[PDB]
Amino acid sequence: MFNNEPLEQIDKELHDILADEEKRQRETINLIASENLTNGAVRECLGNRVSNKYSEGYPKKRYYGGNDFIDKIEELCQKRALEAFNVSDEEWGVNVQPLSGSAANVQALYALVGVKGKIMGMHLCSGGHLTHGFFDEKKKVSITSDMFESKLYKCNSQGYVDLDAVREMALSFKPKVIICGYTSYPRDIDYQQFRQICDEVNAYLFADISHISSFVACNILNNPFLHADVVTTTTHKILRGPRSALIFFNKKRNPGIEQKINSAVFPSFQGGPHNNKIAAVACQLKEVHSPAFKEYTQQVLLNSKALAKALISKQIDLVTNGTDNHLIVVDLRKFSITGSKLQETCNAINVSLNKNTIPSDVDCVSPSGVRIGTPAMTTRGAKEKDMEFIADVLARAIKITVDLQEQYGKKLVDFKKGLPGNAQLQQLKQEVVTWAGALPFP
Amino acid sequence: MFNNEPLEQIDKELHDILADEEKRQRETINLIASENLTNGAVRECLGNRVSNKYSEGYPKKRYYGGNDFIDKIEELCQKRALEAFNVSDEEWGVNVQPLSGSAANVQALYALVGVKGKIMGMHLCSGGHLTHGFFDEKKKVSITSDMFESKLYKCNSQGYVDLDAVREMALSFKPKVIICGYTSYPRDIDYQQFRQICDEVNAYLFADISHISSFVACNILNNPFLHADVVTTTTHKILRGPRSALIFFNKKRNPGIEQKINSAVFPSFQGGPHNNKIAAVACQLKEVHSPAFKEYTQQVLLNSKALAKALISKQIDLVTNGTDNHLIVVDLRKFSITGSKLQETCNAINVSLNKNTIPSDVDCVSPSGVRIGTPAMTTRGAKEKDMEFIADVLARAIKITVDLQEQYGKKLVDFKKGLPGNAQLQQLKQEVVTWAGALPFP
Numbered sequence A, B: 001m002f003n004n005e006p007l008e009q010i011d012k013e014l015h016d017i018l019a020d021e022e023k024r025q026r027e028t029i030n031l032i033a034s035e036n037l038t039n040g041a042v043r044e045c046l047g048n049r050v051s052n053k054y055s056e057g058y059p060k061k062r063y064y065g066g067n068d069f070i071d072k073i074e075e076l077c078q079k080r081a082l083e084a085f086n087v088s089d090e091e092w093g094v095n096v097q098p099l100s101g102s103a104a105n106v107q108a109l110y111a112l113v114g115v116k117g118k119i120m121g122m123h124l125c126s127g128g129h130l131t132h133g134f135f136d137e138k139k140k141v142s143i144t145s146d147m148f149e150s151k152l153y154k155c156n157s158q159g160y161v162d163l164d165a166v167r168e169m170a171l172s173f174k175p176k177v178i179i180c181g182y183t184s185y186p187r188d189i190d191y192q193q194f195r196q197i198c199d200e201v202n203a204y205l206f207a208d209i210s211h212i213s214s215f216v217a218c219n220i221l222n223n224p225f226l227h228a229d230v231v232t233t234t235t236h237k238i239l240r241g242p243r244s245a246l247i248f249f250n251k252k253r254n255p256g257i258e259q260k261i262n263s264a265v266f267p268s269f270q271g272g273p274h275n276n277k278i279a280a281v282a283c284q285l286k287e288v289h290s291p292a293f294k295e296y297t298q299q300v301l302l303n304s305k306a307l308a309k310a311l312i313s314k315q316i317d318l319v320t321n322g323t324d325n326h327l328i329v330v331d332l333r334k335f336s337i338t339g340s341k342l343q344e345t346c347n348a349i350n351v352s353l354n355k356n357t358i359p360s361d362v363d364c365v366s367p368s369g370v371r372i373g374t375p376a377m378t379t380r381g382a383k384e385k386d387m388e389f390i391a392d393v394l395a396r397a398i399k400i401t402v403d404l405q406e407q408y409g410k411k412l413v414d415f416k417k418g419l420p421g422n423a424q425l426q427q428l429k430q431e432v433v434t435w436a437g438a439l440p441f442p
C-alpha cells in the first residue's frame, strides 16, 4: 500500500529544482572551504534502506533485536575511523553516531564539563566555530555559550593564534576545556603548546579538526592525536564523506571518558542513529585509507599553495601571507570593498565563496575578507596550473566590484542594483561556465 | 580526482552487509511501532547531490549565495508541511531543519524556556519520550532533565493519563512548559484539558505528535493545532518520510515565537542543514496530503483495532484494554515472562517488536510488556484479516517463551541458551519468512 513511481513521476515539481541545483553545481567554480562533492558510492549508501531501522544504543548493547546487520555496519565504521586516523583501538575510541559537526561538538563538550562548565575557544571573528563558545554582547548566540560558561581568545593583528594570550586567559579563567582547531584558519596548529597549557591548568584539550581532517589522517599536517584528549571531526568537508560527525576520545589519558562520551551522544542528546549516514561514512573511510586518497589530499595543498602564490602575484593580500592548508582568507581592505559585495559579485559569475572576517574587524558586521578553499575543485580535477585562471577570475571580480561600487554607491542595496545585466559579468560568468562545466563531476 | 565505481565494486564488504540487511527487512514481521519503509522516491532524494550544499541560516537570509535552488526546496517543504497539518501560514510557522526528533525537541524546549527553565512531561516508564525530561534517581539521563529543571507525571494504574495529577503537579511546580504527546501511549490525548491546565499556570503547551502525526494530518484523531503553542514531530514513523523532524509554532498565541524557534535551531544548536533530508521531507509531504495516504492511515488504524481484538480473543491483555491509534502495549504478567524474553523469542522468529514498561512496573529495569504497531506492516500491504495470523504468531511466541523459561530458568543468560536450534522456533521462523517474504516491499 505504497507508491513506488520514480521521483520524476511522483513529484515533477521537486525533481526540476533538483536537476537545476545539479546543473548549478556542475557550472560553478566552487571555492567554499567547507564543501566537496560525494561520489556515487557514498550517495548509494545515503539512499539505502538501512535508514528504516531503529537502533538506539550501541552495538551488542542495543534496546532492540533485529540489529545484527546494523551492528556489523557500526563496528566497521568505528574500526575504519580509528585506522584512517592512525590510532590504536586499544588507546582510542570513536563514536560514529553524531548527526553533524555542531551536535558532535555540543555532545563532546557536555560529556567533558557538563552544564555550567567552563570552556575556552577561538572567537568566531578570528576563525573559531559557533560551537566553540561563541557569544556576543547582545546575546549568547551558541548553546555552547549558554549551557556552558565560555571565554574566547583572539588571534593577533597578523591573524595568528596568540598562545601567550591563551595562557594569560587560561590562568585567570581556569576552565575544564580548551578548544582548538578552527573554521577559517589558514595555518597549522601548535597542539604541543596547547597540551602544555592544558596540563598547567588541568583542563582537557579538545581539537576540532573538521576542516583539516584529511591532512591529519594522511600525516601531511601535525597530528593532534599525540596531544588531545578529544578529537572531533565532520565527515563532509575535505574528508569527502556524507554529512556526519565523529567524536574521538583518549582512553589511556582518561579512563572513564568512553562511557561519558557514549552516554552524551545517547541517550543524553540523540535518539536513534541514522544508519544510512553510518553506512555512507564507512564507505568513505575505506577510500580515506587508500594511498590514492593521500594523492588527492596532497593536491588540495598543492592547489592551495599555488592559489595563494598566484593571488599574491596579482597584489592581492592573504591573511598570514599564505597558507599551510586548504584555505586562504583574502584581506580586501586595500580595495575598499567589503566581503558581502565580492561574494555577490562572485555569485553573479558562478563563483562560490563566502565572506569572512579578518584580524582588523571589530565586530562580525561588515567582514573585510572572503574565504576560499580548494577541496571541491581539486575533487573536480583542477591542477596547479588551473589556479592562475581561478586567481585571474577572482582578480577580475575584485576589479568589477570596485567599478560597480564607485558607480552605484557603498550601500549593498544600491550596489546590487548594478549587478544584473552587466556585460562584463555576463562575459565573465560565461567564461566560468565553459571552464567549470567541462571538469569531471561525480 | 575521484573514484566513481558502483558501491558493489568500490566496497564489496559493506555492500554484502547491506544486501543481507535488506533480506532481513524483507523477511521480518516488523511490528516496531516507530518504524516504516520509505518508497524509492524518498530514497532518491536522500541520495541526491543537494547534500553537497552548505546553506546555513534560512531562505532569503543565507550566509552565502548559490542557494537559489536550495531556497526553493526549503520553502516548498515548509509550505507543504503547513498544508498537510491543515494550518494557515498566516497563523502557524514551521522549521524544517532539525536533524531528528530528539534534536527538534531539545531545540524547541530551549526556545521556550532557555537554560534552567522548568518543564513537565510524561515519565518514560509511563510512555513518555527521553526528551520529555527523563531523569532517574542515579542520574539526569536526558539533557532535557539537566539543562532544564523537569518534573515527570505518571499515568494511572489502568495506563491512562491522570489529569488530576498533572494539575496537582502543574500548580505546585509551576513550569513554563507542559509536554504531551508520547512514545508508547495506545490512546488519544485530551489536548483541551492540557490547554486548560497550562492557562491556569501560564505555561506553554507542547505536543510531540511523532507517533501519531499521520492521524493528526488526516483528521482521524484529535487535532493538537487547536490548543498547542508548539507542535513537534518526526518525519520517519507513521508519516513515512526520512529521518528528520519538524517544529511547528503558533504565531497568533505567541507573536515573536518565530524568531525564538528559528534562532534555537540555528545558530544556537545546529550548523548546516541537510538538504537531502529537506528534499526527502518535501517529497513525502506531497504524498501525505493526498486521499491515497488518508486511505493508508485509516488502514493503519483498522489493522491496529483488529490486532487488539484478535489478541484479546486469545486471552492476551492490552494496556488500557485496547487502542485508539496504531500501537498496542501487551501486558505479559499473566504468563510470568518479561518483555526482554519475548523480544528474544520474536527476534528468533523474525518478529520485530520491542519491550516496553507497563503501569505496574516501578523501574525501567525488567519491563513487563512489549509494544507492537501496524504502520510498517500496513505499509507492506497487510489487511485486517492478516492480523489474526500476526496474533496467531505472537500467541505461539508467548507459549514458546513460557516453555523455554520452565526448561532453562528465569535468568536471561540461561533463557537464551534454549533458543538456538529450537525445532518449534525454526518451524515458526520459517512460517514468518514465507508470509513476510511474499508481501510487497517498497
Ligand SMILES: Cc1[nH]nc2c1[C@](c1cc(F)cc(N3CCC(CC(=O)O)CC3)c1)(C(C)C)C(C#N)=C(N)O2
Pocket: A124, A125, A126, A127, A128, A129, A130, A141, A183, A184, A354, A355, A356, A357, A364, A367, B056, B063, B267
Ligand atoms: C556561518 C558560519 N558558521 N561558522 C562559522 C561561520 C562564518 C561566519 C561568517 C559570517 F560572515 C558571519 C557569521 N555570523 C555573524 C554573526 C552571527 C550572529 C547571529 O546569528 O545573530 C552568527 C553568524 C559567521 C563563516 C565560515 C561563513 C565564520 C566566519 N567568519 C566562522 N568563523 O565560522
Ligand SMILES: Cc1[nH]nc2c1[C@](c1cc(F)cc(N3CCC(CC(=O)O)CC3)c1)(C(C)C)C(C#N)=C(N)O2
Pocket: A056, A063, A267, B123, B124, B125, B126, B127, B128, B129, B130, B141, B183, B184, B354, B355, B356, B357, B364, B367
Ligand atoms: C529505547 C527507547 N527510547 N525512547 C523510549 C524507549 C523505550 C524504552 C524501552 C526500554 F525497555 C528501556 C528504555 N530505557 C531504559 C532506561 C534507560 C536509561 C539509561 O540509559 O540508563 C533509557 C532507555 C526505553 C521504548 C519505546 C523502546 C520506552 C519505553 N518503555 C519509551 N517510553 O521511550
Ligand SMILES: Cc1ncc(COP(=O)(O)O)c(CNCC(=O)O)c1O
Pocket: A033, A034, A100, A101, A102, A103, A105, A129, A131, A181, A182, A183, A184, A208, A209, A210, A211, A234, B054, B270, B271, B272
Ligand atoms: C571547525 C568546525 N566545527 C564544526 C562545524 C559544524 O559542522 P555542521 O555544519 O555539520 O554542524 C564546522 C562547520 N563549518 C562552517 C563552514 O566552514 O562553512 C566547522 O568549521
Ligand SMILES: Cc1ncc(COP(=O)(O)O)c(CNCC(=O)O)c1O
Pocket: A054, A270, A271, A272, B033, B034, B100, B101, B102, B103, B105, B129, B131, B181, B182, B183, B184, B208, B209, B210, B211, B234, B244
Ligand atoms: C514522542 C517522541 N518524540 C521524539 C522522538 C525522537 O526521535 P529521534 O529518534 O528521531 O531523535 C521519539 C522516538 N521514538 C522511539 C520509538 O518510538 O521507538 C518519540 O517517540
Ligand SMILES: [Cl-]
Pocket: A046, A274, A276, A277, B046, B274, B276, B277
Ligand atoms: Cl541523511
